[PDB]
Amino acid sequence: TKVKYPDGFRSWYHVKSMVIQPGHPLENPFGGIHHVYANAEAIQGLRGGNYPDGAVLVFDLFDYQEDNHALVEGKRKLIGVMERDAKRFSATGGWGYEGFGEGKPDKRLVTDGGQGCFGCHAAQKESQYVFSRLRD
Amino acid sequence: ETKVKYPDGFRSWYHVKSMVIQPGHPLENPFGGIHHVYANAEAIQGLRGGNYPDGAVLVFDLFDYQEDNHALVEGKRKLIGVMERDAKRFSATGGWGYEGFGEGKPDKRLVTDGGQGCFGCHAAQKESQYVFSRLRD
Numbered sequence: 001t002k003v004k005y006p007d008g009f010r011s012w013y014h015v016k017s018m019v020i021q022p023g024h025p026l027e028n029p030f031g032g033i034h035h036v037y038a039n040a041e042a043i044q045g046l047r048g049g050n051y052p053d054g055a056v057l058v059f060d061l062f063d064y065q066e067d068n069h070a071l072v073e074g075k076r077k078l079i080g081v082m083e084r085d086a087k088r089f090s091a092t093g094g095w096g097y098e099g100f101g102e103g104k105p106d107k108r109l110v111t112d113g114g115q116g117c118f119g120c121h122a123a124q125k126e127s128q129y130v131f132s133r134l135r136d
Numbered sequence: 137e138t139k140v141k142y143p144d145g146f147r148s149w150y151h152v153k154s155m156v157i158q159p160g161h162p163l164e165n166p167f168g169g170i171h172h173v174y175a176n177a178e179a180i181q182g183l184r185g186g187n188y189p190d191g192a193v194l195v196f197d198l199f200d201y202q203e204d205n206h207a208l209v210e211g212k213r214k215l216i217g218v219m220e221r222d223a224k225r226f227s228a229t230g231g232w233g234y235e236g237f238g239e240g241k242p243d244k245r246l247v248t249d250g251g252q253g254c255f256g257c258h259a260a261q262k263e264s265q266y267v268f269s270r271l272r273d
């Protein structure tokens with residue numbers, strides 16, 4: 001029922017990054033520089049294959065500072081986590097959703113079984129609820 | 137001088153950090169855009185406080201970006217910059233060989249001066265083995 005903290009995620013495949021700045025509709029709460037990481041099982045799904053149970057995607061979100069026309073990574077605000085289990089997480093479409101405040105394992109953020117998170121990712125039904133595309 | 141090898145499979149490597157450089161920054165030409173730093177296993181050793189062993193490779197992956205309603209989105213790859221550790225072969229440039237690959241393509245070598253220009257700026261970081269990037273969590 002609970003999503004595992006994705007230990008060692010920092011050494012996974014870096015899928016992409018995006019910057020969300022003040023004025024963007026998702027500034028709350030996704031404002032900052034974010035990086036998406038995928039484990040080996042997730043990569044198979046991302047490649048065009050299907051997602052094996054045990055596939056994990058991580059949204060790693062940082063605050064940034066402006067420094068003379070550079071945006072520089074500040075403090076980690078949170079990690080978001082999607083964990084593939086077709087049977088266990090079938091209520092939110094095969095992915096378990098969890099947020100860890102400041103990336104800390106103890107600071108689980110999701111209180112509704114991940115309904116809130118799913119509600120937005122459900123628009124991406126046709127690509128198994130993942131927004132991120134693999135690039136070169 | 138001998139040539140820096142193209143770092144095949146660098147995209148699978150450990151993502152050290154990212155930074156955005158916008159118009160007006162000192163490094164706009166030629167480093168403007170979103171860049172990500174990648175390190176092979178041997179480079180991680182040096183980053184974590186060991187010596188950099190020969191074979192250590194750092195990559196600067198530079199993308200253009202588009203600004204679209206207060207989001208910055210990665211566009212096309214502009215270039216990669218490469219540092220390859222070999223204390224013998226790259227002695228003239230402090231043990232690192234420096235190269236640029238236009239659009240990240242192996243044929244599109246950008247360095248014409250044996251990496252002297254790259255080295256000149258990297259030299260300020262003598263104390264940390266000529267590397268700027270620091271490992272973060």
Ligand code: HEC
Pocket residue numbers: 016017018034036057058059080081082097098099110116117118120121129130131132133
């Ligand atoms: C819209 C209002 C969203 C809500 C609420 C949540 N997420 Fe989401 N997520 C959203 C977008 C537009 C993207 C892509 C960002 C990009 O850089 O392209 C994401 C991405 C993720 C990822 C990375 C994998 C992917 O699908 O691309 C993860 C791990 C993720 N999201 C998890 C997550 C969790 C745990 C949420 C509730 C706490 C959550 N998301 C809500 C849009 C929205």
Ligand code: HEC
Pocket residue numbers: 153154155163173194195196217218219234235236247253254255257258266267268269270
């Ligand atoms: C002056 C400023 C320069 C010049 C002329 C070059 N580089 Fe280097 N470089 C510079 C900075 C301030 C940084 C850090 C970016 C960050 O903190 O995110 C870098 C980084 C690199 C990297 C990543 C490794 C590292 O942090 O040291 C590589 C692989 C790299 N630079 C290579 C490189 C090459 C091949 C150059 C000449 C074509 C070159 N640089 C020039 C600062 C400067």
Ligand SMILES: [Zn+2]
Pocket residue numbers: 068069160
């Ligand atoms: Zn200015």
Ligand SMILES: [Zn+2]
Pocket residue numbers: 021023205206
């Ligand atoms: Zn703007």
